Amino acid sequence: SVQIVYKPVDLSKVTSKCGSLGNIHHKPGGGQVEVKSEKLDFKDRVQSKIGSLDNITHVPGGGNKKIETHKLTFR
Amino acid sequence: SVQIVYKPVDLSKVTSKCGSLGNIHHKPGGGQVEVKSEKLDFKDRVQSKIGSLDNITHVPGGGNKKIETHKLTFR
Amino acid sequence: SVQIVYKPVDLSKVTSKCGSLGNIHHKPGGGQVEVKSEKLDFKDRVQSKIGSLDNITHVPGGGNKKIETHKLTFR
Amino acid sequence: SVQIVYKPVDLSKVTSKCGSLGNIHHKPGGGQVEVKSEKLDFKDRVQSKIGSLDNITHVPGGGNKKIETHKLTFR
Amino acid sequence: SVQIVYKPVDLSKVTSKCGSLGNIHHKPGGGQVEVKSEKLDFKDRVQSKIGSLDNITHVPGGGNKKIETHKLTFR
Amino acid sequence: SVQIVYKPVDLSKVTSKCGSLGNIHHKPGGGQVEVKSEKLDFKDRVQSKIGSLDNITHVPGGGNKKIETHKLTFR
Ligand SMILES: Nc1c(F)ccc2cnc(-n3ccc4ccncc43)cc12
Ligand SMILES: Nc1c(F)ccc2cnc(-n3ccc4ccncc43)cc12
Ligand SMILES: Nc1c(F)ccc2cnc(-n3ccc4ccncc43)cc12
Ligand SMILES: Nc1c(F)ccc2cnc(-n3ccc4ccncc43)cc12
Ligand SMILES: Nc1c(F)ccc2cnc(-n3ccc4ccncc43)cc12
Ligand SMILES: Nc1c(F)ccc2cnc(-n3ccc4ccncc43)cc12
């Protein structure tokens, strides 16, 4: 006989407080990018960037993350 | 005989407070990008960027994330 | 005999408060992009960008995310 | 009695030969300029440029110059 | 009694030959410029540039110069 | 008695020959400039540049110069 009981209990807090958030300046001075390739072959589950001059300002008021995997395998 | 009981309990909080959010300046000075290729072959589940000059200002008032995966496999 | 009971309980909060959100300036100074290719072959589930000069201002008042996957497989 | 005999002689050549002139690429990636002032006071014979993002391609087939000043002053 | 005789003789050559002129690439990656002032006072014979991001391609087939002054002063 | 005889003689050559001129690449990677001032006072015969991010490609097929001052003063 097999009995499997899977009862995780989660009471977690992920939390932040900020009084104020601001006066943020992102002022990048350009630039130059060159890429040479011949053949690209991309297959299962690829994340790729080639030849980029990207500027990102990311200012979340919270920006909190919780990541949670439950896996049960029986054979 | 097999009994499998799967009862995860989740009371999670992902939370934030901000009193004010602002005064954000994103002012990029241009730039230059060149890419050369001959052949691109992309198959299953490819995320790709080639030859980009992208500017992003992302300012969510919260921007909080919960990611929660439940997998039960019986063979 | 097999009994499988799958009863996840979820009371999750994903939440945010912002008193004010604003005074955001996105002012990009142009730029230049060149891409050369000969052949593009894209098959299942491809997300692709080629030769881009994109400006994005994304300011959600919340922008909170919950992603929740339940998979039960019986073979 | 005073005699002034001002007789300059000039058989100068300013000259060029070019067999072919070309394949010229001027390809600038943008940029960003900011100038702050409160007061400008410009008087006689002022040449001024303030806050400029200027692109010039100048390709004369000759572009040769002769500058020649003659000045006789008597008091 | 005074005699002034002023007879410069000029047979000068300023000269060039080029068989071909070309394949010139001017390709600048942007940039960022900021200038702060309060008061500018410019008087006689001022040549001025303030806050500039200038790109120049100058390709004269000759571009030869002769500059020449002939001053006679009698008091 | 005064006799002043001014007879300069000039037979000179300034000269160049080039078989071919080319394959020139000027490719600058941007950059950043900040200047702070309060008062500028400019008077007779001033040549000035303040806060610049300038790119110059200068390719004369000749580019030869002759500068020539003749001056005579009498009292
Ligand atoms: N999620 C993505 C794709 F689907 C494809 C290409 C990517 C390239 N880059 C990032 N990336 C994230 C954070 C970071 C920081 C610095 N550089 C790069 C970064 C994420 C990608
Ligand atoms: N979600 C996406 C696609 F479907 C295809 C291409 C992508 C390229 N890039 C990102 N990416 C995310 C964050 C980050 C940060 C820096 N660079 C790159 C980034 C995401 C992509
Ligand atoms: N969802 C998409 C498509 F269906 C196809 C192409 C894409 C390229 N890019 C992004 N992307 C997202 C975030 C980010 C950040 C930076 N660069 C790139 C990004 C998303 C894409
Ligand atoms: N002739 C002019 C005016 F009447 C007033 C302003 C000027 C500003 N600049 C130039 N100038 C010439 C060549 C060069 C090269 C680089 N930067 C600047 C230049 C000339 C002007
Ligand atoms: N002729 C002019 C004006 F009437 C007023 C401003 C000027 C600023 N600059 C130049 N200039 C010439 C050659 C060079 C090279 C580099 N930087 C600057 C230059 C010339 C000017
Ligand atoms: N002719 C000019 C003006 F009337 C006013 C400003 C100037 C600033 N700069 C130059 N200049 C020439 C050659 C060089 C090389 C490097 N830097 C600077 C240069 C020339 C000017």
Swiss-Prot record, chains A, B, C, D, E, F:
Post-translational modification note: Phosphorylation at serine and threonine residues in S-P or T-P motifs by proline-directed protein kinases (PDPK1, CDK1, CDK5, GSK3, MAPK) (only 2-3 sites per protein in interphase, seven-fold increase in mitosis, and in the form associated with paired helical filaments (PHF-tau)), and at serine residues in K-X-G-S motifs by MAP/microtubule affinity-regulating kinase (MARK1, MARK2, MARK3 or MARK4), causing detachment from microtubules, and their disassembly. Phosphorylation decreases with age.
Site feature location: Not glycated: 7, 13, 17, 27, 36, 39, 66, 71
List of glycosylated residues: 43, 49, 65
Sites bearing N6,N6-dimethyllysine, chain numbering: 7
Subcellular location: Cytoplasm, Cytosol; Cell membrane; Cytoplasm, Cytoskeleton; Cell projection, Axon
Domains: entry comment: The tau/MAP repeat binds to tubulin. Type I isoforms contain 3 repeats while type II isoforms contain 4 repeats.
Subunit structure, as described in the record: Interacts with MARK1, MARK2, MARK3 and MARK4. Interacts with PSMC2 through SQSTM1. Interacts with SQSTM1 when polyubiquitinated. Interacts with FKBP4. Binds to CSNK1D. Interacts with SGK1. Interacts with PIN1. Interacts with LRRK2. Interacts with LRP1, leading to endocytosis; this interaction is reduced in the presence of LRPAP1/RAP.
Name of the protein described by the UniProt record: Microtubule-associated protein tau
Species of the source: Homo sapiens
Record lineage: Eukaryota, Metazoa, Chordata, Craniata, Vertebrata
Recorded name of the encoding gene: MAPT
Shown residues in whole-protein numbering: 622 to 696 of 758
